[PDB]
Write a protein that holds these residues in place. Structure first.
Motif, PDB file in Angstrom:
ATOM      1  N   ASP A  41       0.825  -1.201   0.000  1.00  0.00           N
ATOM      2  CA  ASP A  41       0.000   0.000   0.000  1.00  0.00           C
ATOM      3  C   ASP A  41       0.863   1.258   0.000  1.00  0.00           C
ATOM      4  O   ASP A  41       1.719   1.440   0.866  1.00  0.00           O
ATOM      5  CB  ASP A  41      -0.929   0.006   1.215  1.00  0.00           C
ATOM      6  CG  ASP A  41      -1.955   1.121   1.153  1.00  0.00           C
ATOM      7  OD1 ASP A  41      -2.809   1.092   0.242  1.00  0.00           O
ATOM      8  OD2 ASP A  41      -1.904   2.024   2.015  1.00  0.00           O
TER       9      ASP A  41
ATOM     10  N   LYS B  56       1.866  -3.549   4.206  1.00  0.00           N
ATOM     11  CA  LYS B  56       0.712  -3.320   5.065  1.00  0.00           C
ATOM     12  C   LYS B  56       1.015  -3.768   6.491  1.00  0.00           C
ATOM     13  O   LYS B  56       0.917  -4.949   6.808  1.00  0.00           O
ATOM     14  CB  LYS B  56      -0.510  -4.069   4.529  1.00  0.00           C
ATOM     15  CG  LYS B  56      -1.210  -3.352   3.387  1.00  0.00           C
ATOM     16  CD  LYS B  56      -1.988  -2.144   3.883  1.00  0.00           C
ATOM     17  CE  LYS B  56      -3.308  -1.991   3.143  1.00  0.00           C
ATOM     18  NZ  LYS B  56      -4.314  -1.245   3.951  1.00  0.00           N
TER      19      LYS B  56
ATOM     20  N   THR C 228      -2.977  -5.932   9.158  1.00  0.00           N
ATOM     21  CA  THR C 228      -3.860  -5.455   8.105  1.00  0.00           C
ATOM     22  C   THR C 228      -4.516  -6.635   7.393  1.00  0.00           C
ATOM     23  O   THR C 228      -3.869  -7.331   6.611  1.00  0.00           O
ATOM     24  CB  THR C 228      -3.068  -4.618   7.099  1.00  0.00           C
ATOM     25  OG1 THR C 228      -2.501  -3.481   7.726  1.00  0.00           O
ATOM     26  CG2 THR C 228      -3.904  -4.132   5.938  1.00  0.00           C
TER      27      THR C 228
ATOM     28  N   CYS D 281      -5.975  -8.677   4.785  1.00  0.00           N
ATOM     29  CA  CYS D 281      -5.991  -8.597   3.327  1.00  0.00           C
ATOM     30  C   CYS D 281      -6.956  -9.617   2.732  1.00  0.00           C
ATOM     31  O   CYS D 281      -7.438  -9.449   1.612  1.00  0.00           O
ATOM     32  CB  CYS D 281      -4.594  -8.826   2.754  1.00  0.00           C
ATOM     33  SG  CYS D 281      -3.256  -8.029   3.694  1.00  0.00           S
TER      34      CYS D 281
END
Length: 83
Positions: free
Chosen positions: A49, A54, A58, A60
């Motif tokens: 990102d 990330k 995070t 995904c």
């Protein structure tokens, strides 16, 4: 807008041929160098990102519902399902 150095990447954003001058030597993208620039840990992907991975935690992805959940590890462009 400036000349699309490498034609507006149709699926890069750091991969190569950024094209879009907005990134051509600036937005962690090399439209004139066909690649990503320093500071960019990943060009794009599940754990990619902006110009870095990330941060671990995070989400995904996720199998079906919420058991282990897929989370980034802030050390790769891939996000393991934790399965």
């Amino acid at each position: 807008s400036p000349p699309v150095c490498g034609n507006k990447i149709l699926e890069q954003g750091e991969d190569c041929d950024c094209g879009s001058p907005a990134n051509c030597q600036d937005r962690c993208c090399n439209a004139a160098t066909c690649k990503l620039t320093p500071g960019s840990q990943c060009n794009y992907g599940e754990c990619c990102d902006q110009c870095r991975f990330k941060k671990a935690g995070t989400v995904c992805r996720i199998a079906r519902g919420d058991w282990n959940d897929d989370y980034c590890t802030g050390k790769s462009s891939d996000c393991p399902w934790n399965h």
